[PDB]
């Protein structure tokens, strides 16, 4: 098992990238105030191999200016989990 590297980027579109993980099974989602967003209000990457024996994926959602502090990206992989804010 290889734990994902999780990185959140703000462009407002916020994107949560999980990279370099194994096995391919992973849960990633945006939350607003801890409440998991529906699948249909997020944009989803495929889970793709990276040529080093691991996988990567991503999930994005569109938010309004000033709402960043309400949004977090939740990850579960291989019995572990984490929560990441939008960087400021």
């Amino acid at each position, epitope marked *: 098992t290889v734990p994902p590297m999780v990185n959140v980027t703000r462009s407002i579109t916020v994107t949560c990238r999980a990279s370099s993980f194994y096995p391919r099974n992973i849960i990633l989602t945006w939350r607003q*105030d801890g409440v998991s967003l529906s699948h249909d209000t997020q944009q989803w990457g495929d889970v793709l191999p990276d040529g080093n024996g691991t996988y990567q994926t991503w999930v994005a959602t569109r938010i309004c200016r000033g709402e960043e502090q309400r949004f977090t990206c939740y990850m579960e992989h291989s019995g572990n989990h984490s929560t990441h804010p939008v960087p400021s």
Partner: antibody
Amino acid sequence: IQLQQSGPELVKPGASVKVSCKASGYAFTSQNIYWVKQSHGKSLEWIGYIEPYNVVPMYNPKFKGKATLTVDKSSSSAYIHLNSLTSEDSAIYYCARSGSSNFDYWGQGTTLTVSS
Amino acid sequence: EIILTQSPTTMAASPGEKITITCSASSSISSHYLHWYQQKSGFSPKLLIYRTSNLASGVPARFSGSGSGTSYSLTIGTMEAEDVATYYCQQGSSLPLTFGAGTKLEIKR
């Protein structure tokens, strides 16, 4: 999933109180804990929530400087500290946990009476 | 804050009656951030409907919800004795999070 709160409390006006909420049935740091006030015969009022993984609270401005939210991993518990207590603070206080909604699961409530 | 106005304040339904209660928001919200709770007397509230129309775990199929914008509703397709409770709508679109004042449903017999 179970949220078990501490028992009823009588506290003197002007003093403080800390109410606990022990969360079981899921990984403690994987979901936000919320707090709600219900005065007798009245509606539900959101106090605040805390994201336990990074320990980041958010407060209703109605309760800024009244309520302080904390967590503790060894007890699998969230806490609400209420200061400068008055009769208006007498109410049932509920812990809750978000998920698909802001309040997927609720504790049993804690009755706080502020009186001398 | 977003004010949620629930109507009726109270209502008695006959057994087997289809009953609809309404939640009106002071401004437009996404249906994904509107939820309903049921509080039976002597108990804590429980999640009933999430994101406007999705039944929570343990909730029987006679419940449903609809709405968008500023206008939301909850329907019980056939009123049963165990459905006597206060029903609250709640929005999570904007901070502070707010609840309606509740609709108290009782049953005729």
